[PDB]
Design an enzyme around this catalytic site. Structure first.
Site, PDB file in Angstrom:
ATOM      1  N   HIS A  68       0.825  -1.251   0.000  1.00 40.11           N
ATOM      2  CA  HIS A  68       0.000   0.000   0.000  1.00 40.11           C
ATOM      3  C   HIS A  68       0.845   1.282   0.000  1.00 40.11           C
ATOM      4  O   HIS A  68       0.733   2.083   0.886  1.00 40.11           O
ATOM      5  CB  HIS A  68      -1.002  -0.041   1.124  1.00 40.11           C
ATOM      6  CG  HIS A  68      -2.095  -1.029   0.908  1.00 40.11           C
ATOM      7  ND1 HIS A  68      -2.115  -2.220   1.555  1.00 40.11           N
ATOM      8  CD2 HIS A  68      -3.195  -1.001   0.112  1.00 40.11           C
ATOM      9  CE1 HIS A  68      -3.218  -2.880   1.218  1.00 40.11           C
ATOM     10  NE2 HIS A  68      -3.902  -2.151   0.333  1.00 40.11           N
ATOM     11  N   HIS A  72       1.609   1.645  -5.774  1.00 36.40           N
ATOM     12  CA  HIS A  72       0.186   1.184  -5.859  1.00 36.40           C
ATOM     13  C   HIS A  72      -0.708   2.355  -6.298  1.00 36.40           C
ATOM     14  O   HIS A  72      -1.571   2.163  -7.205  1.00 36.40           O
ATOM     15  CB  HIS A  72      -0.250   0.579  -4.529  1.00 36.40           C
ATOM     16  CG  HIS A  72      -1.704   0.283  -4.441  1.00 36.40           C
ATOM     17  ND1 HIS A  72      -2.302  -0.636  -5.264  1.00 36.40           N
ATOM     18  CD2 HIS A  72      -2.663   0.734  -3.603  1.00 36.40           C
ATOM     19  CE1 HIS A  72      -3.584  -0.735  -4.937  1.00 36.40           C
ATOM     20  NE2 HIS A  72      -3.839   0.103  -3.924  1.00 36.40           N
ATOM     21  N   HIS A 106      -6.119   7.401  -3.106  1.00 38.77           N
ATOM     22  CA  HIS A 106      -7.124   6.509  -2.465  1.00 38.77           C
ATOM     23  C   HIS A 106      -6.551   5.739  -1.277  1.00 38.77           C
ATOM     24  O   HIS A 106      -7.376   5.185  -0.508  1.00 38.77           O
ATOM     25  CB  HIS A 106      -7.799   5.584  -3.479  1.00 38.77           C
ATOM     26  CG  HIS A 106      -6.970   4.384  -3.739  1.00 38.77           C
ATOM     27  ND1 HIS A 106      -5.836   4.435  -4.514  1.00 38.77           N
ATOM     28  CD2 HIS A 106      -7.105   3.121  -3.340  1.00 38.77           C
ATOM     29  CE1 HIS A 106      -5.307   3.223  -4.553  1.00 38.77           C
ATOM     30  NE2 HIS A 106      -6.027   2.415  -3.802  1.00 38.77           N
ATOM     31  N   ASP A 107      -5.228   5.637  -1.120  1.00 35.26           N
ATOM     32  CA  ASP A 107      -4.630   4.899   0.032  1.00 35.26           C
ATOM     33  C   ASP A 107      -3.657   5.787   0.821  1.00 35.26           C
ATOM     34  O   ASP A 107      -2.825   5.240   1.547  1.00 35.26           O
ATOM     35  CB  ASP A 107      -3.980   3.601  -0.408  1.00 35.26           C
ATOM     36  CG  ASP A 107      -4.897   2.379  -0.499  1.00 35.26           C
ATOM     37  OD1 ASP A 107      -5.798   2.232   0.357  1.00 35.26           O
ATOM     38  OD2 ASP A 107      -4.578   1.515  -1.351  1.00 35.26           O
ATOM     39  N   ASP A 217      -8.454  -0.698  -8.238  1.00 35.57           N
ATOM     40  CA  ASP A 217      -7.772  -1.040  -6.965  1.00 35.57           C
ATOM     41  C   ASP A 217      -7.181  -2.442  -7.007  1.00 35.57           C
ATOM     42  O   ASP A 217      -6.126  -2.676  -6.363  1.00 35.57           O
ATOM     43  CB  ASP A 217      -8.708  -0.880  -5.784  1.00 35.57           C
ATOM     44  CG  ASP A 217      -7.975  -0.835  -4.472  1.00 35.57           C
ATOM     45  OD1 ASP A 217      -6.703  -0.594  -4.476  1.00 35.57           O
ATOM     46  OD2 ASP A 217      -8.658  -1.041  -3.468  1.00 35.57           O
ATOM     47  N   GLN A 269      -5.627 -17.743  -3.244  1.00 38.75           N
ATOM     48  CA  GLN A 269      -5.699 -16.940  -4.510  1.00 38.75           C
ATOM     49  C   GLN A 269      -6.884 -17.418  -5.370  1.00 38.75           C
ATOM     50  O   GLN A 269      -7.675 -16.541  -5.855  1.00 38.75           O
ATOM     51  CB  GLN A 269      -4.349 -16.941  -5.237  1.00 38.75           C
ATOM     52  CG  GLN A 269      -3.288 -16.100  -4.535  1.00 38.75           C
ATOM     53  CD  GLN A 269      -3.703 -14.644  -4.458  1.00 38.75           C
ATOM     54  OE1 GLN A 269      -3.753 -13.931  -5.465  1.00 38.75           O
ATOM     55  NE2 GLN A 269      -4.067 -14.206  -3.254  1.00 38.75           N
TER      56      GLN A 269
END
Ligand SMILES: O=C(Nc1nc(CN2CCCCC2)cs1)c1nc(C2CC2)cnc1Nc1cncnc1
Ligand SMILES: [Mg+2]
Ligand SMILES: [Zn+2]
EC number: 3.1.4.17
Length: 318
Positions: A68, A72, A106-107, A217, A269
């Site tokens: 993050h 990113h 956004h992060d 995202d 996953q």
């Protein structure tokens, strides 16, 4: 005013493609963003000097965590660029401006820990924001930077355009809380199939922009396999540190976060592609047909994870 950003030929061509990787040269990521704003939005959207100052304060407020991080932010903004460039005529001027900025921000100030961990830790942010804890913080950090002297990239908008664009950014950032994604996608599924989906209905546009924010995202699962596999490593470095922090609070973490359970990653996953990613890109592709390459690339990566389980290939990092 006549001052375009231009990239080397390989980047100038591949940046248009959904599966573009922004590369390991951090000092090129600001120029890659400005290139995308100029081509997506216009060279008049923002004052260059204010945009550059905004970008550099945003970068400074991303932390040096494994996943993050600033890389990113820029990666998520590129996926938005590719969606917008493939759907030229569907989005308003204010939406083009807002959504690239939303993705870059956004992060903001992410610490590498989930909303769950902050609540179990009893972090002060969990008392200030009871749901979508980190996402309300990310929006709050965005407004803080926008209010720094010389950082108001929206200064030429009317008072009501400014309120509208900040409201696009707030909803876009809140939508990156994957807890909200499941119900958002279910409603978009029903709306599309019963034929009630209406892009003139503001609450409909909001839902579609939310699903776009989930798609951008998660876009590390839409890269070529060697990129996706090496990025998986970074997000598990965070998951495992959070698990360690759960063990320090006397809580057995979920297996996803338990570094003693590395063997369970391939199956985890599979669940993630089948329960989150494939359905996300499937509904995106129904609403916005030109985004099909994201779905195709996601299906390609699910198939590589299935090969990992059949031992027809490995990870190393697992
Ligand atoms: O694997 C992920 N999440 C994961 N979630 C689980 C748990 N599972 C979820 C589905 C239903 C059953 C329970 C396993 S891995 C993941 N999560 C995010 C956001 C939700 C935080 C972003 N990228 C992710 N993976 C990834 C892989 N390769 C490259 N880049 C990213
Ligand atoms: Mg987030
Ligand atoms: Zn994110």
């Amino acid at each position: 005013g006549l001052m375009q950003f231009t990239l080397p030929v390989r980047l100038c061509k591949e940046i248009e493609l959904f599966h573009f990787d922004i590369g390991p040269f951090e000092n090129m990521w600001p120029g890659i963003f400005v290139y995308m704003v100029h081509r997506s939005c216009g060279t008049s959207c923002f004052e260059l000097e204010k945009l550059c100052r905004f970008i550099m304060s945003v970068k400074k407020n991303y932390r040096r965590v494994p996943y993050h991080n600033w890389k990113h932010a820029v990666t998520v903004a590129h996926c938005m660029y590719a969606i917008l460039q493939n759907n030229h005529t569907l989005f308003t001027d204010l939406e083009r401006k807002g959504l690239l900025i939303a993705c870059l921000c956004h992060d903001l100030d992410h610490r590498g820990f989930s909303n769950s961990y902050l609540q179990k830790f009893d972090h002060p942010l969990a008392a200030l924001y009871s749901t979508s804890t980190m996402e309300q913080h990310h929006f709050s950090q965005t407004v803080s930077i926008l209010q720094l002297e010389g950082h108001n990239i929206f200064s030429t908008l009317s008072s009501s355009e400014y309120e509208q664009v900040l409201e696009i950014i707030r909803k876009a950032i809140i939508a990156t809380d994957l807890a909200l994604y499941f119900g958002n996608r279910k409603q978009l599924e029903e709306m599309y199939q019963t034929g009630s989906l209406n892009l003139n209905n503001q609450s409909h546009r909001d839902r579609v922009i939310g699903l776009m924010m989930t798609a951008c995202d998660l876009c590390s699962v839409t890269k070529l396999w060697p990129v996706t596999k090496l990025t998986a490593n970074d997000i598990y470095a965070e998951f495992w540190a959070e698990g360690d922090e759960m063990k320090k609070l006397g809580i057995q973490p979920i297996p996803m976060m338990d570094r003693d359970k590395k063997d369970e990653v391939p199956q985890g996953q599979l669940g993630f592609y089948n329960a989150v990613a494939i359905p996300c890109y499937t509904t995106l592709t129904q609403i916005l047909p030109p985004t099909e390459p994201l779905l195709k690339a996601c299906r390609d990566n699910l198939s590589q994870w299935e090969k990992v389980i059949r031992g027809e290939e490995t990870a190393t990092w697992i």
